[PDB]
Design a protein around this ligand. Structure first.
Ligand SMILES: NC(=O)C1=CN([C@@H]2O[C@H](COP(=O)(O)OP(=O)(O)OC[C@H]3O[C@@H](n4cnc5c(N)ncnc54)[C@H](O)[C@@H]3O)[C@@H](O)[C@H]2O)C=CC1
Ligand SMILES: NC(=O)C1=CN([C@@H]2O[C@H](COP(=O)(O)OP(=O)(O)OC[C@H]3O[C@@H](n4cnc5c(N)ncnc54)[C@H](O)[C@@H]3O)[C@@H](O)[C@H]2O)C=CC1
Ligand SMILES: NC(=O)C1=CN([C@@H]2O[C@H](COP(=O)(O)OP(=O)(O)OC[C@H]3O[C@@H](n4cnc5c(N)ncnc54)[C@H](O)[C@@H]3O)[C@@H](O)[C@H]2O)C=CC1
Ligand SMILES: NC(=O)C1=CN([C@@H]2O[C@H](COP(=O)(O)OP(=O)(O)OC[C@H]3O[C@@H](n4cnc5c(N)ncnc54)[C@H](O)[C@@H]3O)[C@@H](O)[C@H]2O)C=CC1
Ligand SMILES: C[C@H](CCC(=O)NCC(=O)O)[C@H]1CC[C@H]2[C@@H]3[C@H](O)C[C@@H]4C[C@H](O)CC[C@]4(C)[C@H]3CC[C@]12C
Ligand SMILES: C[C@H](CCC(=O)NCC(=O)O)[C@H]1CC[C@H]2[C@@H]3[C@H](O)C[C@@H]4C[C@H](O)CC[C@]4(C)[C@H]3CC[C@]12C
Ligand SMILES: C[C@H](CCC(=O)NCC(=O)O)[C@H]1CC[C@H]2[C@@H]3[C@H](O)C[C@@H]4C[C@H](O)CC[C@]4(C)[C@H]3CC[C@]12C
Ligand SMILES: C[C@H](CCC(=O)NCC(=O)O)[C@H]1CC[C@H]2[C@@H]3[C@H](O)C[C@@H]4C[C@H](O)CC[C@]4(C)[C@H]3CC[C@]12C
Lengths: 255, 255, 255, 255
């Protein structure tokens, strides 16, 4: 039977990376307003702090922390910070990442960078957080991958393969952590209206994108936040190892 | 930001096939109690009526329809009855299906039956409902497929291939119906405790299933009803052409 | 070490459906010239007979049979004919099929037709042929599916879902028949230059298709025949349940 | 029509990494005996030299190169040595890789090592070779990934996710290199009898593997060499961006 409480995050403590803007920001606000206490992390301390204020304005509990996910030291600090501020961790939303389009002949530095952003940071932070969740009797890890993990196109070698690594990591991690009663899932968004997309889109590309999208409109950070809430809520207690695609039923590519 | 009303079906009218028991029943009760007026269809009239009583007592709005999904005539009858009783149709939950394990040398009647149950019925009911939804400016169609659509094992030719067809129909129908502003998704359940699972499961099989499921337990009709609620709710307005697997992160097979 | 004999079909007897033209014709000629005796079946007896002549001109062994794959009676006759002419069956190449683009509101007759052509015929013929292969100690079944089994687009509900059923049938049949030492595989071609494609393509559609194909050219029946040979040869003795896609690395769609 | 010469590598020059043993060795011998001049690279010099002798005795043309794929410096050295010895490079077989099962709490060095082995090396060697192939008007790149790229199980995070990245890199690289007229494919082997499999397999595990494999037997290096020959031959001129699984139609896992 319907139970509104299972759709809420009352008393859960969550860490959210790259939450100063875009998708992460919206996930933070939705989670905080759904009842969770949140640590808003970002490499931009100002942005992270502004999000904290908004959450407080809405009557939520939140703390800011500048954390560059591409640093194992900063990741460890982030975990220590959340535990001292929240007392425990129930949810990890690994949202920060990126990399974007790159030519095949890119320097190896750029290729590896995409792995630092989407894979190594994600795996290490989960290693840091897992013991805490285990002590509390379980938890939920959620990562934001990309449709690029399944799409095939030119100028996407680093971005697409690193996101594909992260998506498969989710399927396998679900096994190692299932015994600790931790669920692991991911969301693969299509084109979502954020500054990240704005830096690479054009009107022509936009029209083409809409041409290949059944529910004709680009995505909004709230579409992703809604999906994140469900996947991290008790309403999805038997959903693990899955990657949910939010795309309006279509595909949006640069080509 | 979180909005509890975006996770409800207030003022929505839904048709649910095979709602007399198991997963179908749970979806019917969960939807009614989340605000939707429900038409409970099932081949077993007594079961349909019982569910309708359970809903009304819960303060819900529901009607019963003895419909055999494998009959073109009874499908359009179901369609007519629902629009007359409910006034409109916003949601179609194609749950009824089946078939099960069968030996390679089964009569062609058996092989074809799986397709009558999981494919032709589904497709035809959608054609019947789509014009109504189009007239209203939108709607949602959800079908219950199965992990069999992705698993490979012995004695599963008819069941697995017909569910695979239903899953791929979902990805393509999303394109055709997207123009009418209709979303189409499916849920692929793993081992769910219903009379159906109970008819082929043995304690030896259960143990194997569990040893291959990270979130160690068998699914429950409620796990599927929760996912169905989300997929059919306004919170999933940009989710289409997707199949969500509810499996505890593992795989439950008979072999 | 390299062994040219493992790439040949010396002394094998093969049945090939829809072999009067296009892909099937080329598979027949390549198989016959690789050492196999072949039964060339088609609904067009004249076309089937012309292929037989060409094979004989090339010095191969071949027999023609008019067989409408959408008739269980004609399928049974085809199996009886091949056994009386060849004495045994080692290989079945289920190539006939089709259906093409259809609007969502197509008559149910058209939707079912695609299943008759791509699924039911394929399954029944395999049931007919399996015992023969079993008596000879094994065999190989190969079906020609389509990239439509994975592609998503409008006006493809019947075609795409029926091909998806056939592809998953292959993955599951491999299990039932593995015990009889029969391998089962499929080939999913992209756009191949045949009259079937010619009936639906246009210059604009052609350019677009080439725009999305890395190895820039449309496919030829020989590309498919080459793949068919490998998959049915002793060189692929441990390849079963697979679907090989021949597409130039791209995707060719009507939209 | 059949043409034995289209299945050979006469006059082609190939670089094969990890060719000192197992799958790599078999590919080297099979390619040399099908007509190609081969550069056998391996970290183990003695093994590389031995293979070179075996080939020459078979009347083949080969050279040895002690290359550690995990070194950017040794990779460009390998590239330079091959173009100097062979004169040109037409085929690159990226075979060397590894990593294996690892616990979730493994040192980050271990997690990163799998990526050095299966991803960064592969990508960088391809960048080094692509210009040569482009100059000649074409070439072929083949990488040996693994069924781990699709399987999900415990103790496989590093190995499975890095192989998943290598497989997706293949699908995307096909686009970038297609313009240079270069085809890119991969082969995902199941359980193959090599010293590597022998280091983690136990008679109890073998039996389980076999009970889940329709074509009941474990793979052999030759099964992979046969598939590699085909994918790198003119017979596969329109096959790109694909991963061919050689698995006996089943799944072989450690759990
Ligand atoms: N925007 C889109 O269309 C899609 C985005 N994604 C993924 O969503 C995630 C977020 O992207 P958007 O919200 O669109 O981007 P955005 O640019 O709008 O927001 C990214 C936020 O993360 C922060 N950030 C950047 N580097 C960081 C680092 N090294 N450490 C910690 N925080 C850092 C930024 O300062 C910014 O506040 C990424 O993982 C991206 O790959 C996936 C699919 C679609
Ligand atoms: N139980 C499980 O483990 C899983 C079930 N499924 C799917 O879920 C759906 C429902 O399954 P369960 O709830 O387990 O079954 P169930 O047997 O518990 O309930 C099925 C209901 O469908 C009704 N029904 C059967 N044939 C009908 C027909 N021809 N026309 C109208 N109504 C009909 C029955 O009277 C019954 O009330 C099916 O499509 C099944 O394939 C998918 C994955 C797992
Ligand atoms: N042409 C393409 O681009 C692609 C074709 N396919 C598949 O390849 C297969 C063959 O198609 P094409 O060679 O292009 O077509 P085609 O039209 O060139 O040849 C089809 C042949 O099969 C025969 N045929 C038709 N109906 C038959 C029936 N009921 N019973 C027996 N034989 C029958 C025809 O008379 C004809 O000789 C089909 O299964 C098709 O879906 C898959 C992917 C791509
Ligand atoms: N054996 C199996 O069951 C399967 C193996 N694979 C993959 O096949 C590839 C080769 O595997 P096997 O033939 O089984 O291994 P193997 O151990 O039998 O042979 C590996 C060869 O690679 C060489 N090698 C190792 N590291 C190297 C490095 N850093 N630089 C240069 N050479 C190096 C070794 O000296 C050895 O000669 C690997 O990528 C592996 O992941 C994939 C699926 C199954
Ligand atoms: C350019 C930025 C990354 C910037 C950065 O972090 N550095 C990336 C991050 C998310 C990416 C988008 C997505 O992941 C969604 C989508 C995926 C398709 O494969 C390509 C287009 C498309 C729409 C991507 C374009 C490139 C984007 C917008
Ligand atoms: C036997 C019944 C169908 C009964 C009927 O329709 N008659 C079918 C319907 C749902 C099926 C189950 C599923 O769909 C889920 C799961 C899928 C796996 O591939 C096999 C096991 C497993 C657990 C299936 C076993 C057989 C079940 C229980
Ligand atoms: C129109 C004919 C079917 C005619 C018939 O059998 N009736 C079908 C058979 C093969 C089909 C083609 C393929 O299967 C290959 C390809 C698959 C894409 O999903 C759509 C375009 C494209 C290129 C298809 C267009 C429609 C074709 C050409
Ligand atoms: C242990 C070795 C790696 C040794 C090393 O690089 N050090 C790895 C490489 C190939 C691996 C095998 C494969 O890639 C194939 C197969 C894949 C399954 O997901 C797990 C079992 C299985 C059979 C793997 C077991 C572990 C193996 C044998």
């Amino acid at each position: 039977m319907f139970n509104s409480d299972n759709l809420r995050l009352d008393g859960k403590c969550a860490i959210i990376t790259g939450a100063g803007a875009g998708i992460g920001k919206e996930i933070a606000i939705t989670f905080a307003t759904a009842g969770a206490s949140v640590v808003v992390s970002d490499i931009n301390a100002d942005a992270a702090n502004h999000v904290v204020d908004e959450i407080q304005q809405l009557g939520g509990q939140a703390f800011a922390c500048r954390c560059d996910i591409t640093s194992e030291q900063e990741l460890s600090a982030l975990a220590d910070f959340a535990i001292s501020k929240l007392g425990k961790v129930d949810i990890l939303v690994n949202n920060a990442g990126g990399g974007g389009p790159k030519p095949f002949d890119m320097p190896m530095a750029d290729f590896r960078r995409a792995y630092e952003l989407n894979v190594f940071s994600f795996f290490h932070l989960s290693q840091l957080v897992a013991p805490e969740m285990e002590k509390n009797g379980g938890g939920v890890i959620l990562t934001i991958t990309s449709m690029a993990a399944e799409n095939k196109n030119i100028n996407m070698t680093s971005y697409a393969s690193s996101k594909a690594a992260a998506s498969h990591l989710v399927r396998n991690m679900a096994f190692d952590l299932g015994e600790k009663n931790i669920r692991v899932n991911g969301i693969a968004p299509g084109a979502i209206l954020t500054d990240a997309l704005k830096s690479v889109i054009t009107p022509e590309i936009e029209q083409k994108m809409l041409q290949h999208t059944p529910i004709r409109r680009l995505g909004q950070p709230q579409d992703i936040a809604n999906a994140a809430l469900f996947l991290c809520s008790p309403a999805a207690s038997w959903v693990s190892g899955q990657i949910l695609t939010v795309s309006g039923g279509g595909v949006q590519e640069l080509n």
